[PDB]
Structure 1
Amino acid sequence: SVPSQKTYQGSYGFRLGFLHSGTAKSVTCTYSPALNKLFCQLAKTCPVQLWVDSTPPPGTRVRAMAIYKQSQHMTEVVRRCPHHERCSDSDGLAPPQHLIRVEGNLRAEYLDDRNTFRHSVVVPCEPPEVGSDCTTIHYNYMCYSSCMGGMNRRPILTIITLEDSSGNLLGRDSFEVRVCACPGRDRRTEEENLRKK
């Protein structure tokens, strides 16, 4: 009824990482460690790093799914709003209803769960390129947090799960997301509100 959000490193030491993009007015994606919250513009690249302490088996995959953060909304499927699901902006692979897309990965698969109706996007787990210490997935969020008839100002969390080839859990991490026009300003405001509290 509600997917778990419990952080779980598992046998491979799985966890996420984020770049340090700052809070300038022009920034398009920025992550707040103090809030565990990503702030991003609509349909812009969100680099999310994957870190492990040891190599998971061939066939391991990485799934992303959004849920509402507030308990009274957690059973509602997070989906694109009535405008954005109809705006014909598909990449040829993501269903138009899905909030979260993966950029530039032809092996991405989009699931409409037959029992929960929830949406997710899953890719093969890949090792870092030679010379790199981690792997990065580029996500896009395809509605604003404020979109009426969709998220409608309700905060969401993205849950990233490392899965075996059957879909069994190997690791889990998560972060809050706000999709907004000015992520740098909103991160600064929310961090200041946190400090004042």
Structure 2
Amino acid sequence: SVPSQKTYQGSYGFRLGFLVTCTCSPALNKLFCQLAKTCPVQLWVDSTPPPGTRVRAMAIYKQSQHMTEVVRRCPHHERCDGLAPPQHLIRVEGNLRAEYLDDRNTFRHSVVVPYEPPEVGSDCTTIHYNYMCYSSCMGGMNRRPILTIITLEDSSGNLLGRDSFEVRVCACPGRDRRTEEENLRK
């Protein structure tokens, strides 16, 4: 079954926040980012989850007619850090404990890091993601919009919380955000 995108704050009050290489549109719930550049995603909790809590990131297609298709890199960007497998769209930057996972039954990719409390000077835990293929790449996303689903999980993989956002990976994020926002006003 297609991974759920249902927002679920859960017992710890889990939700995301956001912070031109990367720009977020709250009105569109959409992140616009350049290829392979830092995308800061903030984790907010009302209380601290138990030891061994994990944070998983996974991409799915937004449109229902493409939801059962695995999101992966196009051949050009696949065939081009030594930790992320070449097929994975999403990689984590600056984390010594990233796990790159392929689901045995769905073939979907994800990247998991341990949950850490907020870094000094912050009320939220910031994770730096990189997207390794453009929304427009033929043989990959092929202009189809995607969602990133962030799941807070216990050490066994049980769901503690879930949030999600749309992503466009593009060369001019600031300009594309304005275009899509101008389209929503019209």
Range into which the TM-score falls when normalised by the shorter chain: over 0.9
SS across alignment from 1:83: helix
Shift, 1:135, TM fit:
0.8
Q: Partner of 2:129: helix, strand, or coil?
A: strand
2:143, 2:41 → 1: CA distance? 23
Return the alpha-carbon distance in structure 1 between the equivalents of residues 68 and 6 of structure 2.
17
What is the CA deviation profile of residues 98-118 of structure 1, one whole-angstrom value per residue up to 9, with x for unaligned ones?
000000111000001111000
For residue 129 of structure 1, report the CA deviation from its aligned partner.
2.6
Q: Does 1:50 align with 2:43?
A: yes
SS in 2 for 1:57: coil
Residues 51-76 of structure 1, C-alpha deviations (whole Å, 9 max, x = no match): 00001001000000000000010000
With over 3 angstroms needed to count, the CA separation of the structure-2 counterparts of 1:113 and 1:133, relative to structure 1, is same
| SS class of match (1:72) | helix
Unaligned stretches of 5+ in structure 1? 20-26
Query: Quick check: 2:58–2:109 contact (8 Å CA) kept in 1?
Result: yes
Distance 1:82 1:131 in 2: 41
- Whole-angstrom distance in 1 between the partners of 2:119 and 2:131: 25
CA shift at 1:183, angstroms? 0.4
User: Residue 154 of structure 2 aligns with which residue?
Assistant: 164
Q: Secondary structure at the match of 1:96?
A: coil
Displacement of 1:78 in angstroms is: 0.1
The partner residue of 1:61 within 54, 60, 74 is 54
User: 2:126 aligns to what SS in structure 1?
Assistant: strand
Instruction: Name the % identity.
Output: 99
Q: Matches of 1:131 and 1:34 in 2, distance apart?
A: 27
Structure 1 distance, partners of 2:18, 2:120, is 20
| Distance across 2 between alignment mates of 1:6 and 1:155 | 17
RMSD: 0.7
Moved beyond 2 Å, runs of 4+? 129-132
Are the equivalent residues in 1 in contact too, given 2:119–2:126 (CA < 8 A)? no
Pairwise CA distance, 1:186:
0.5
The aligned counterpart of 1:81 is 74
Structure 1 counterpart of 2:176, from 173, 186, 189: 186
Counterpart pick for 1:71 among 64, 67, 70 = 64
1:85-135 deviations in whole A, cap 9, x for unaligned? 100xxx111000000000011100000111100000000000113442111
Alpha-carbon distance in structure 1 between the residues aligned to 2:145 and 2:121: 37
**Matched-pair contact (CA < 8 Å) for 2:54–2:153:** yes
Cα deviation code 1:28-63 (max 9, x no counterpart): 100000000000000000000000000100100000
Instruction: Report the Cα distance in structure 1 between the residues aligned to 2:40 and 2:54, rounded to whole angstroms.
Output: 17
CA deviations over 1:157-178 (Å, ceiling 9, x no partner): 0000000000000000000000
Query: Structure 1 CA distance, aligned partners of 2:95 and 2:153?
Result: 18
Does structure 1 retain, via aligned residues, the 8 Å contact 2:136–2:142?
Answer: yes
